[PDB]
């Protein structure tokens, strides 16, 4: 493992220090349909005319990004994305900007979100959840190895590719940091106690998120939910969790150590780092090497109805894409 990571670090570094820019243009893409929306942007299926390929184009409104004070976060996302490379991270193929927007063109994953499949099915069996969780485990070991904190693990940010494997999306909160950070960021149900308390935190909040993910995948609902955020934060810090009766003893053990409010005992943040996770009973049947290569049998294959098929995605109201005659936030996004 140390071998692979060492070289992965060398490649990321070169790209990090010399990020690619303006590698495409809006008019080289055919706007097909909206696959999702966010506070300051949207993602659409697009078709690259020269190659006939489909991609997921993320369009960010520079003015909204500024109003929401996510300028640096948006710069973090593209800079990081153009530099990383892992089998469970969706690839940033092209990036560019125009008068009104920033654009990040990623590889399209027709399979759809884990969220959709998870909600419809209810809950995943333990081997099913173990297969996806394992992929997140290698992805986090990879990211943290590069001094990156992800900060938004959740089913809504996980896609299922043609091979049944996971593809992580949304690096809007990713950040390269050695040492503590304080930005309050994430999703209510997945926030670690440190974040809600405003106490400076590290990569350990990613490992706590994994604990929330595994629990939600195996139970059908998150360990901490309520109709309003403040109620959800009250549960998270209380250091009190309840487990469904069908949760194996090993599964409950792994989660007790993951959903540890005391980030001095929390698995992943210990002296043995990620190994305390990879070597936990619940993962004894897991062949970490096999999972990376993807030679492990996937429990679910979301067969699609052809390339460019958006059947596995929900519908969203279509928004017209306009580009003003004037440049809006040049200085702010000069390095994009």
């Amino acid at each position: 493992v140390k071998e692979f990571l060492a070289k992965a670090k060398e490649d990321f570094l070169k790209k990090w220090e010399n990020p690619a820019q303006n590698t495409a243009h809006l008019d080289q893409f055919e706007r097909i349909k909206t696959l999702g929306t966010g506070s300051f942007g949207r993602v659409m299926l697009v078709k690259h005319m020269e190659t006939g390929n489909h991609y997921a184009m993320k369009i960010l409104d520079k003015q909204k990004v500024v109003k929401l004070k996510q300028i640096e976060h948006t710069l973090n996302e593209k800079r990081i994305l153009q530099a990383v490379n892992f089998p469970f991270l969706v690839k940033l193929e092209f990036s560019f900007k125009d008068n009104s927007n920033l654009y990040m063109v990623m590889e399209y994953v027709p399979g759809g979100e884990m969220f959709s499949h998870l909600r419809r099915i209810g809950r995943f069996s333990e081997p099913h959840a173990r297969f996806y969780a394992a992929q997140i485990v290698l992805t986090f070991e990879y990211l943290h190895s590069l001094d990156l904190i992800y900060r938004d693990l959740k089913p809504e940010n996980l896609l299922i590719d043609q091979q049944g494997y996971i593809q992580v999306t949304d690096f809007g909160f990713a950040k390269r940091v050695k040492g503590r950070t304080w930005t309050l960021c994430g999703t209510p149900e997945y926030l670690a106690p440190e974040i809600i308390l405003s106490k400076g935190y590290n990569k350990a909040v990613d490992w706590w998120a994994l604990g929330v993910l595994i629990y939600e995948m195996a139970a059908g609902y998150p360990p901490f939910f309520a109709d309003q955020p403040i109620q959800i934060y009250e549960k998270i810090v209380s250091g009190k969790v309840r487990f469904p009766s069908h949760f194996s003893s090993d599964l409950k053990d792994l989660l007790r150590n993951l959903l540890q409010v005391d980030l001095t005992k929390r698995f992943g943040n210990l002296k043995n780092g990620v190994n305390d996770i990879k070597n936990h009973k619940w993962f004894a049947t897991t062949d970490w090497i096999a999972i990376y290569q993807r030679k492990v049998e996937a429990p679910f294959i979301p067969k699609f109805k052809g390339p460019g098929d958006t059947s596995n995605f929900d519908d969203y109201e279509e928004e017209e894409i306009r580009v003003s005659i004037n440049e809006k936030c040049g200085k702010e996004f000069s390095e994009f």
Binding site: G38, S39, L68, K69, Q70, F115, R119, G122, D152, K154, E156, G172, F173, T183, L184, C185, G186, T187, P188, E189, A219, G220, Y221, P222, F225, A226, D227, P229, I232, R242, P244
Partner: peptide, 20 residues
């Protein structure tokens, strides 16, 4: 059941991120 409570809650849909 907790499953029932969850499904009846307002947080079964896509959850938005927070920051400000």
């Amino acid at each position: 059941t907790t499953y029932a409570d969850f499904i009846a809650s307002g947080r079964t849909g896509r959850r938005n991120a927070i920051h400000d």
